[PDB]
Amino acid sequence: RARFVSKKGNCNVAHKNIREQGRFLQDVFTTLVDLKWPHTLLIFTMSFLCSWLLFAMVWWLIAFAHGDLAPGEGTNVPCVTSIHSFSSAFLFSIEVQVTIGFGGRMVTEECPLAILILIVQNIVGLMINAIMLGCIFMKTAQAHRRAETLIFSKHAVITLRHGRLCFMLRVGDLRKSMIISATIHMQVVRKTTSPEGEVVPLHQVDIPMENGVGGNGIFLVAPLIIYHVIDSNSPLYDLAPSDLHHHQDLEIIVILEGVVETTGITTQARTSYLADEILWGQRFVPIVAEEDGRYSVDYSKFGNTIKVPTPLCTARQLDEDRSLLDA
Amino acid sequence: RARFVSKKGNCNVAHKNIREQGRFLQDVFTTLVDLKWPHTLLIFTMSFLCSWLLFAMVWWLIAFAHGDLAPGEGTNVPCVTSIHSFSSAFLFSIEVQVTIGFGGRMVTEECPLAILILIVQNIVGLMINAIMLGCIFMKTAQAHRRAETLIFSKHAVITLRHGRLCFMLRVGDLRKSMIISATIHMQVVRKTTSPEGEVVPLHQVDIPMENGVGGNGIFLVAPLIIYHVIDSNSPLYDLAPSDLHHHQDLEIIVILEGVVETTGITTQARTSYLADEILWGQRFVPIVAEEDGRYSVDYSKFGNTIKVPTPLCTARQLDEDRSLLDA
Amino acid sequence: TLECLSRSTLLCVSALTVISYVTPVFLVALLPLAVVCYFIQKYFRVASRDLQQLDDTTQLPLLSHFAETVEGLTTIRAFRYEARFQQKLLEYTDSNNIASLFLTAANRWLEVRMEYIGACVVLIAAATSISNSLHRELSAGLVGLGLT
Amino acid sequence: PLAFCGTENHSAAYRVDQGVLNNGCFVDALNVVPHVFLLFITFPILFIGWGHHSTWLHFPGHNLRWILTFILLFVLVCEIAEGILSDGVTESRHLHLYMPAGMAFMAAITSVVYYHNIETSNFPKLLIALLIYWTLAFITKTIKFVKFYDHAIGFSQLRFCLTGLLVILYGMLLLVEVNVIRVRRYIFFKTPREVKPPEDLQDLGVRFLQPFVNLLSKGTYWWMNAFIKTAHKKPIDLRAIGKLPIAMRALTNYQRLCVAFDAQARKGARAIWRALCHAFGRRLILSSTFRILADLLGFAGPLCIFGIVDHLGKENQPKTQFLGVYFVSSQEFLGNAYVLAVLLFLALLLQRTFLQASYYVAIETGINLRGAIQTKIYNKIMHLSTSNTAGQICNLVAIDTNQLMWFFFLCPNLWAMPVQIIVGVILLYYILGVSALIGAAVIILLAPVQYFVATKLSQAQRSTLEHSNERLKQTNEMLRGMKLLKLYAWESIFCSRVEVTRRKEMTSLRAFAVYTSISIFMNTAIPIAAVLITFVGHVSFFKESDLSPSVAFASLSLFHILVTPLFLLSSVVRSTVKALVSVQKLSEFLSS
Ligand SMILES: CCOc1cc(CC(=O)N[C@@H](CC(C)C)c2ccccc2N2CCCCC2)ccc1C(=O)O
Ligand SMILES: Nc1ncnc2c1ncn2[C@@H]1O[C@H](COP(=O)(O)OP(=O)(O)OP(O)(O)=S)[C@@H](O)[C@H]1O
Ligand SMILES: Nc1ncnc2c1ncn2[C@@H]1O[C@H](COP(=O)(O)OP(=O)(O)OP(O)(O)=S)[C@@H](O)[C@H]1O
């Protein structure tokens, strides 16, 4: 069966029959940022080589039409000096676009269309150069490889915490960089049938993360347990321990967003638990241990999830049993 | 009749009698970023050509005053070599501003005001060049064309969901880039008359988006339905199915903001439904379908909105009928 | 069918042998084209098999439906169920048509690919045999043999 | 070493003292520029867009511009050829002869790729880049034409005809570009039009996208590729196969046929034939045109072998015109045998793709006819009275509509095989003189013999089917009562009776197999005898011209091309009379 989001955040949806009005390339610039680094290299080098070949074309053409490729050098003045071939023209063009300009073949005061062409060549060079500089600055500040090291426990566990069923995962920030203002959103992706007769195929219901402040935000330095209280008025209320098998239509996506501390750019790390990934009656093994003089975190036991006796039944039946024991 | 915001986010308001103290051009820089790409090209090229013409002016002037344009070359030393005309001066100026410097016309140790001018020419060149680089980096990171591919359903529909009247639209993110931390704000723009005698002409009342977490935020990969519960204590409470015609003073603006995943810059996509755009008694046709091994989303049926029998009356009368059936 | 398969395989092998004897260098280019030919033939064969089985299996419902409609015609006209049965017939005949059409399209795909391989073979043979009949001693008539 | 205007008289070709624009090899250099413009404006955009599921849309003038660009690449291959041929003489390779045309080639290919990208992405404003290109390519080519005219180059030389063809084709592509910009005003305008790609292409479940591809893919069935690859990994299900487009549905074809029937009733078997004509004749004659063009271009092969072998079997250029540039003429050009080889290759490739396209269009129109006729005979079943033969109607759907559809499959052959055989006999006579007529008569004698053998084979088939049906009834008797037979061990006697019936059926199968063997042997032996009589009578009996390699092998290739139509003409005629009887029977039924 298909899932919504892979275990590595790679979303699994396929988009079909997209009427594009040229909007995917009217944004040439974020398209040119998102081109993978080899693709960006090849676009970079194409846009330079083609420009040089173009203006070398023009230069050789002018020197032809100016009568500067005929022998008989001494009598007349070249429009730019000692262009002898399309090799000379290609080198002269390179030297004036990349501004090395050895000056062996320098433009002279002689014929204006060369002056005008050399203006044009400098200006388009400046233009494309600044365009590529900026695009690959935007590409130097891409923070995709930072969300590659924010990790989630492979198994999420439902355990009895403070007398209530709680659904927990564990997340960890491997680097020293504090991904500032981290915020976590969890949604139970499950097909929902409406009492009025509406069935939506990938319905997403946000489940509230349990916090003392009543918000969705974590201070992530040591790997921490993100848990959700399944008391009531939220999905998973009727999650029996039997319904946790492979082909059960039940997924939970988690998505944590925050700016990286260093490049100051928001990023997002996401993962998903299918009904088989989520274990019942387990609790996460402790990780932090007070070492010599610090709080040493052991990532070996990150997702071990020791099992512990929990009442195997739905949370609704748990509340019903509490109500019956009370009265 | 006029609307507040066009169907393409282009806001329709006209601003008149604006006492500007020079504040629209005291911000020359975001003005120079927001100049459309052709306008930015022309400003770029003007600011280069004018600089070259200026410093070529100065160079030819100096070489004149230094007595370097008179024939009789061998006796005296040029202040910069082999300037023969304002062509030579223009080429020398280009070569030193754009740093090609073929060196056929190089400044010599001879006369200081040229040294000082060449200092000035290099420094202003560096200054304007870095100014333009930075402005068009800021312009390479403009994310207007990204909000051109976040799309809203052309028709919003009011349907009975879970026994309550709900106002729904559908939105979709065409690209693979997850527009991180998406947040949606909806406001019912309608002329409001106050009981104390105050009538405001474009009053905006925020209507709460229905979420299980009680917030305004979506995980947008597959096109999803944004719906608002019209139970009470919010506008549209008295929206009869008859009041949905063209000339009814009623608009609903929606505005979703979030940083693009790639250039890490916040953007915003907005749209508006007039009283005729919003349909009654329809429900959005399902879109996601489990294909071969993925969740294929079909954008052909994006805004089809099949009709379904709903009680055609106001939501207040719906609550009154429920109360009467209860007792 | 066995006779024609024998004749086709032997004629193809014979033509390749002739244009390799006339042109020894063509044999070097034969192996890439032979590999491409084998791959195309395999992929065709599997697709054509599936499409042929499907095209056969969708034709039985159509004739069966015709038989039924002729048998219980008076009953169907009694129920005024004529529109439903015409809809069912349109569906059956559309299934049959789409099957036969995809079958013929796969056939055309294979035949175009094989004809382009044959065109590349004739270009290589022509060019190399003409070059050898100009620079080398290669005879005039062997060039025409390899050409045909 | 590698000079554009080859180094001559100390590179005197570069001196532009004479009014630059009328210095050839500079006007030839001006052409290299617009092609560089297109290449370098496009390759970046193409590779940024090359770095979803679209349901593409066609810009109007689509097929026309594809045809034009095909012709363009053809004339450019010819121009590369004439150039490379045209500087075999001198010592330095004049690059300006072929390098500008060989550059225009890649430029045209990029043009088709770029326009296709824009078509798929429906960004019509990008087409402005082509809007420039053709202009330049027009102008610089016209400038090349005019200056040619000034030295009285004339039509005498091939290069002038090719450059005129080029000016014409660039004018055509400029007209097509402006056509596109006119219908869908994407340049600065009111920006009115949005075409909303067709509905049947948006159905997730219409996977037979043969009508919805560019003409090149329509011809190569390139789309099928994807399908077939999928069809190799996992099996083919009715979900994997799409459903038919709106253009080819039972209802669509049925309504078309009914409109044709109304038109014919406003003005019997003849009525049905004329209605089928009025309903499917456009596609039928389109397939026939493809088929006849493929026949002629296939005949273009043997004559080319003749030319090649005549050139190389001989033992071997004037008109140096542009003050140093040589100019090869049409007669020397078509006698190079290197040019002849690539022209044979191009003609062969185009002929084979036209042939396969003829086959496909005929198949599609036949299948649509089958759908329409089935729906019509069923709609007639609905209305007929209870007074009236269920199996008759069942087989009328099973075998009679099948014969009609197969007549519509082979219908282009019926019109283009006589043309094929006529032109083949004419070409053979033109090549080999009088002995070719004897050879062609000997080979034409294959068709009536094959027809007679097929008729006898069908007669033997019926006489075999009788005994086969009787043996089947006896086997069914033996198999129904196998219990009782085994209970009293009467199985051997009934098996002996079944074996006697089988021996009678084998007696008839002997005659059937003799007729099949005669068919195979005639089919493979009439051509050998034809070649034998042709050549021997040409040399000994006629005492005619000596048998040269070119002449003989051209005649052999023409015989191989003549074999197939002569063999299949019998089958075409038999299928035609069979389907005529089928339409008669269908009219008799539909009239009641
Ligand atoms: C070339 C085979 O592709 C077809 C081609 C057609 C149309 C067609 O002009 N056929 C010619 C054969 C070709 C080689 C001339 C023909 C003519 C007369 C009798 C039978 C046949 N034949 C048709 C059945 C198979 C071959 C003998 C239809 C259907 C097909 C098909 O893919 O089934
Ligand atoms: N027509 C206008 N266009 C632009 N800005 C305005 C305009 N009117 C007022 N403002 C700004 O709005 C602020 C307060 O508006 P007002 O109270 O209406 O006028 P004001 O403050 O009395 O004007 P000042 O402070 O004496 S210059 C001021 O800081 C003005 O700069
Ligand atoms: N298949 C699709 N691919 C991309 N965008 C789409 C697609 N279908 C609809 N849209 C966009 O979604 C918005 C509204 O969707 P729909 O209501 O379903 O169609 P629509 O609005 O009637 O099309 P328009 O506005 O007449 S061009 C439009 O602005 C479209 O641009």
Residue D456 makes CB contacts below 8 A (sequence gap 6+) with D515
Q: Return the DSSP state at D385.
A: -
Distance B302 CA to ligand 3 centre (A): 7
Map residue C15 onto helix, strand or coil: helix
Both tokens assigned to D44: 């970046």
Type of residue numbered C67: A
Contact call for A267 and B214, based on CB within 8 A:
no
Shortest alpha-carbon distance between residue D141 and chain B (Å): 32
Cβ-in-10-Å burial (0-12, 13-18, 19+) of A246 comes to exposed
Report in angstroms the alpha-carbon separations of D190 from A23, B2, D187: 19, 21, 9
Do the two chains B and C touch, given a threshold of 8 Å on CB pairs and at least 3 pairs? no
Whether D202 and chain B come into contact, CB under 8 Å, resolves to: yes
Nearest to B146 by CA among B179, B183, B172: B179
Nearest to D461 by CA among D513, D499, D503: D513
Q: What is the side-by-side strand order in the sheet with B266-274?
A: B204-207, B180-189, B251-259, B266-274
Compute the half-sphere exposure of residue B324: CA atoms within 13 Å on the CB side of its CA: 6
Map residue B185 onto helix, strand or coil: strand
Nearest to D76 by CA among D143, D16, D137, D121: D137
Nearest to B69 by CA among A117, A81, A109: A109
Nearest to D240 by CA among D214, D211, D204: D204
Shortest alpha-carbon distance between residue D24 and chain C (Å): 32
- Pick the atom of ligand 2 nearest to B17's CA: 1
Which residue has the least CA distance to atom 14 on ligand 1?
Answer: D564
Contact D569, D420 (CB under 8 A): no
Query: Is the beta carbon of B300 within 6 A of some atom in ligand 2?
Result: no
How far is residue B102's CA from residue A122's CA, in Å, rounded to a whole number? 14
C80 conformational bin, left if phi > 0, alpha if psi -120 to 50, beta if neither: left
Contact call for C141 and D309, based on CB within 8 A:
yes
Q: Cα B218 vs. chain centroid, distance in angstroms?
A: 21
Give this entry's resolution in angstroms. Answer: 3.3
How far is residue D437's CA from residue D579's CA, in Å, rounded to a whole number? 34
Tokens 């949606």 -> residue: B184
Contact A60, A89 (CB under 8 A): yes
The partner residues of B224 in beta bridges, in order of sequence, read B171
Report in angstroms the alpha-carbon separations of A310 from A209, B117, C109, D165: 22, 84, 63, 87
Whether B40 has a binding-site annotation, put simply, is: no
How far is residue D402's CA from residue D369's CA, in Å, rounded to a whole number? 10
Type of residue numbered A50: C
Scanning D180-209 for CB atoms below 8 A from C yields 208
Q: Return the DSSP state at D320.
A: B
Tokens 């990208």 -> residue: D117
How far is residue A203's CA from residue A252's CA, in Å, rounded to a whole number? 11
Residue D5 makes CB contacts below 8 A (sequence gap 6+) with D11, D13, D14, D25, D26, D94, D95, D96
Query: Is the beta carbon of D406 within 6 A of some atom in ligand 1?
Result: no
Whether D54 and chain B come into contact, CB under 8 Å, resolves to: no
Q: What are phi and psi of B182, to 5 degrees?
A: -75, 135
Scanning D94-123 for CB atoms below 8 A from A yields 121-123
Sign of CA dihedral A180, A186, A189, A192: negative
Which residue has the least CA distance to atom 28 on ligand 2?
Answer: B19
Element holding A204 (H helix, E strand): strand A204-207
Residue B303 makes CB contacts below 8 A (sequence gap 6+) with B153, B154, B155, B170, B284
Map residue D241 onto helix, strand or coil: coil
How far is residue D135's CA from residue D34's CA, in Å, rounded to a whole number? 9
Compute the half-sphere exposure of residue D479: CA atoms within 13 Å on the CB side of its CA: 6
Type of residue numbered C109: W
Whether B140 and chain D come into contact, CB under 8 Å, resolves to: no
Q: For residue A50, list chain D residues with Cβ-Cβ distance below 8 A.
A: 39-40, 43-44
Sign of CA dihedral A71, A72, A76, A77: positive
Report the 10 Å Cβ neighbour count for C36: 14
Tokens 């009053």 -> residue: B203
Whether D501 has a binding-site annotation, put simply, is: no
Both tokens assigned to A310: 């929990």
How far is residue C140's CA from residue D313's CA, in Å, rounded to a whole number? 5
Query: Is the beta carbon of B19 within 6 A of some atom in ligand 2?
Result: yes
Q: What are phi and psi of C16, to 5 degrees?
A: -65, -40
Nearest to B139 by CA among A35, D411, A30: A30
Tell me the DSSP string of D399-453: IIHHHHHHHHHHHHHHHHHHHHHHHHHHHHHHHHTTHHHHHHHHHHTHHHHHHHH
Whether B314 has a binding-site annotation, put simply, is: no
How far is residue D104's CA from residue D116's CA, in Å, rounded to a whole number? 18
Residue in D386, D524, D549 closest to C74 by CB: D386
Q: Where are the alpha helices (DSSP H) in D314-389?
A: 330-333, 339-383
Cβ-in-10-Å burial (0-12, 13-18, 19+) of A322 comes to exposed
Classify each residue of D169-188 as buried b or exposed e, where b means 16 or more C-beta atoms within 10 Å of its C-beta. bbebbbebbeebbeebebee
Compute the half-sphere exposure of residue C40: CA atoms within 13 Å on the CB side of its CA: 20
Tokens 């610039």 -> residue: A29
How far is residue A192's CA from residue B115's CA, in Å, rounded to a whole number? 78
Contact call for D382 and C86, based on CB within 8 A:
yes
Nearest CA in chain B to D234: B292
CATH numbers and ranges of domains, chain B: 1-13+143-327 (2.60.40.1400), 14-142 (1.10.287.70)
**Sequence-distant contacts of C49-58: CB under 8 A, at least 24 apart:** C50/D231, C50/D235, C50/D236, C51/C99, C51/C102, C51/C103, C51/C106, C51/D231, C51/D236, C52/C103, C54/C99, C54/D236, C54/D238, C54/D241, C55/C96, C55/C99, C55/C100, C55/C103, C58/C92, C58/C95, C58/C96, C58/C99
Contact D143, D305 (CB under 8 A): no
Quick one: angle between helices D401-432 and D339-383, nearest 10? 160
Nearest to A47 by CA among A58, A32, A36, A62: A32
Q: Where are the alpha helices (DSSP H) in B83-146?
A: 86-97, 112-140
Q: Angle CA(D111)–CA(D114)–CA(D119) in degrees, nearest 5?
A: 120
The partner residues of B256 in beta bridges, in order of sequence, read B184, B269
Q: Which ligand is nearest to the CA of D415?
A: 1
Contact D118, D110 (CB under 8 A): no
Sign of CA dihedral B68, B71, B74, B75: negative
How far is residue A157's CA from residue A306's CA, in Å, rounded to a whole number? 10
Query: Is the beta carbon of D142 within 6 A of some atom in ligand 1?
Result: no
Contact B182, A187 (CB under 8 A): no
Q: For residue D122, list chain B residues with Cβ-Cβ distance below 8 A.
A: none
Both tokens assigned to D402: 């099948």
Q: For residue D204, list chain B residues with Cβ-Cβ distance below 8 A.
A: 289, 296, 298, 300
Q: Angle CA(D161)–CA(D162)–CA(D165) in degrees, nearest 5?
A: 85
The preferred substitution site among D351, D369, D402, D568 for testing ligand 1, maximizing ligand atoms within 8 Å of CB, is: D568
How far is residue D320's CA from residue D302's CA, in Å, rounded to a whole number? 33
Residues in chain C: 148
Distance B20 CA to ligand 2 centre (A): 10
Contact D6, D326 (CB under 8 A): no
Nearest to B278 by CA among B213, B211, B319, B230: B230
How far is residue A154's CA from residue A165's CA, in Å, rounded to a whole number? 20
Whether B233 has a binding-site annotation, put simply, is: no
Type of residue numbered A165: L
Whether A105 has a binding-site annotation, put simply, is: no
Q: For residue A90, list chain D residues with Cβ-Cβ distance below 8 A.
A: none
Classify each residue of B9-24 as buried b or exposed e, where b means 16 or more C-beta atoms within 10 Å of its C-beta. beeeeeeeeeeeeeee
How far is residue D14's CA from residue D17's CA, in Å, rounded to a whole number? 9
How far is residue D508's CA from residue D298's CA, in Å, rounded to a whole number? 42
Query: Is the beta carbon of D359 within 6 A of some atom in ligand 1?
Result: yes
How far is residue D423's CA from residue D297's CA, in Å, rounded to a whole number? 12
Classify each residue of B204-237 as buried b or exposed e, where b means 16 or more C-beta atoms within 10 Å of its C-beta. eeebebbbebebbbbbbbbbbbbbbbbeeeebbe
Contact C3, D520 (CB under 8 A): yes
Residue D54 makes CB contacts below 8 A (sequence gap 6+) with A17, A18, A20, D120, D121
Report the 10 Å Cβ neighbour count for D383: 9
